[PDB]
Amino acid sequence: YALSYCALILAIVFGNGLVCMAVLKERALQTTTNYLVVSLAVADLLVATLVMPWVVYLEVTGGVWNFSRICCDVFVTLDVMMCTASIWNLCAISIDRYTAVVMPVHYQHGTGQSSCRRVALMITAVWVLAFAVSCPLLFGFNTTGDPTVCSISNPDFVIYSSVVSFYLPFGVTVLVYARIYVVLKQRRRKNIFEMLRIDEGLRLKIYKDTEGYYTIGIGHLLTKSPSLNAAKSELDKAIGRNTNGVITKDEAEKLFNQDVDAAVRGILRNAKLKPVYDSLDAVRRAALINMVFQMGETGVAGFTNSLRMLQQKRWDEAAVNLAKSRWYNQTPNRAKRVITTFRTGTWDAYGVPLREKKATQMVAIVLGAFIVCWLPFFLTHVLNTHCQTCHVSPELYSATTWLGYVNSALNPVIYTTFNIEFRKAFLKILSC
Numbered sequence: 001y002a003l004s005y006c007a008l009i010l011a012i013v014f015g016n017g018l019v020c021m022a023v024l025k026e027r028a029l030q031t032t033t034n035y036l037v038v039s040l041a042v043a044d045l046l047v048a049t050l051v052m053p054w055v056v057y058l059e060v061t062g063g064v065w066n067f068s069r070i071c072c073d074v075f076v077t078l079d080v081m082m083c084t085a086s087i088w089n090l091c092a093i094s095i096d097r098y099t100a101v102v103m104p105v106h107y108q109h110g111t112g113q114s115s116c117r118r119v120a121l122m123i124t125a126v127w128v129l130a131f132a133v134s135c136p137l138l139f140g141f142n143t144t145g146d147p148t149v150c151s152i153s154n155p156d157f158v159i160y161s162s163v164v165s166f167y168l169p170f171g172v173t174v175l176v177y178a179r180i181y182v183v184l185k186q187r188r189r190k191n192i193f194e195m196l197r198i199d200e201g202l203r204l205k206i207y208k209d210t211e212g213y214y215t216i217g218i219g220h221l222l223t224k225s226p227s228l229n230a231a232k233s234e235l236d237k238a239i240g241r242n243t244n245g246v247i248t249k250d251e252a253e254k255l256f257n258q259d260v261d262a263a264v265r266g267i268l269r270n271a272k273l274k275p276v277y278d279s280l281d282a283v284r285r286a287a288l289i290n291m292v293f294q295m296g297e298t299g300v301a302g303f304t305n306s307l308r309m310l311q312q313k314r315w316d317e318a319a320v321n322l323a324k325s326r327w328y329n330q331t332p333n334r335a336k337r338v339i340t341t342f343r344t345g346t347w348d349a350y351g352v353p354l355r356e357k358k359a360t361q362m363v364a365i366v367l368g369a370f371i372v373c374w375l376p377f378f379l380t381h382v383l384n385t386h387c388q389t390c391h392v393s394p395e396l397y398s399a400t401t402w403l404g405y406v407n408s409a410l411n412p413v414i415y416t417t418f419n420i421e422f423r424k425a426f427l428k429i430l431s432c
């Protein structure tokens, strides 16, 4: 393992040096996921420039350390800190996907805004957790039986780190990804009910809506009066018990299922909206209900141009038509999802986007790469220092460590493999 390590050294500063270059420059690649990928790329850049040079020195000698014990402590803590930073970032990303999968319509909205003061706080956390875990070595816990041997030999620390460095964040991510699978495997279609839940949202206490009117449950307007009494009075009336401002989920649901009925009926009694709704399909019908839910039977009746266009089955035209509206400027995201539903006649507007599936797939493999690279070590290093049946030759140990450092240079090879836009930006910086 003589020049091999030096090859790896450059491979790591090369790939992850690019990964950073791509994100910082490429507008498209500047997303919350990627920003965490940067910090993970930084964990590998530091490893290659502050830890592996010393790993290459201890390799040239037969495991003899001629430098200050203070210089050994720094070296060993950094090695722990980066590896701690890696696995934990990796977990931060896992949760990031979990939210993009479980709550996909909200994820897109909450990544398109001042969503850096979160990312900041996640990266920060991960590094500060990284440091605290490693710092004991710095303040004396790097004890060995000979000063020329520079290694983590402490029986207590090794157990601690193994849990906090690996078996905990690994256990988190594995159980997160367990749930990612469960959800994506459970491809339940959507309907009018799940649609409006997303768009309207569900609340149990009374609240003032966008117009300033008292509301509760899934967009149910209680009263246009400025009285919180009248609101509760109408709320009781609609449920059949003295609520006092609060309801249950299931109450909220039944109240909603009525409003949807009233919405259907309201349209069939309308002399403008009925012929449209008859010539629409189960799904596209659902988007008309949705507009009338948002805007009432007569407001929706005022898109004369678009209502005809939907009857004449001109879908694409109607969509470009409805964008030009005051409805769109007011609530532009909800419009985009209703208009897409009309255009396509599908619920891909409320699904998990392709872009995100492909990310969630990618970072499953980056995680896979890790556990394959680092699990060998954490089993060997634990069993070498807590020993009874030490079938643990130093030849093996050098491999398990070698394998662990190989991991760093792999990430950018995975990012080019599966992500097209990285692959695009990488050849863009290399082509100059």
Ligand SMILES: CCc1cc(Cl)c(OC)c(C(=O)NC[C@@H]2CCCN2CC)c1O
Binding pocket: 055, 076, 079, 080, 081, 083, 084, 151, 152, 157, 158, 159, 161, 162, 165, 378, 381, 382, 401, 404
């Ligand atoms: C089990 C807890 C544990 C956790 C972490 Cl993050 C560690 O650093 C990777 C170690 C560890 O042995 N480091 C020092 C060794 C010797 C120099 C290189 N390096 C191996 C990568 C370690 O024993």
Ligand SMILES: OC[C@H]1O[C@H](O[C@H]2[C@H](O)[C@@H](O)[C@H](O)O[C@@H]2CO)[C@H](O)[C@@H](O)[C@@H]1O
Binding pocket: 200, 209, 210, 213, 215, 219, 220, 221, 222, 259, 263, 292, 293, 294, 295, 296, 297
């Ligand atoms: O506009 C018809 C609907 O009015 C209420 O719900 C609205 C209301 O306009 C307001 O709270 C807000 O803009 O959203 C919700 C629906 O989007 C009624 O409670 C509904 O039954 C009507 O469909």
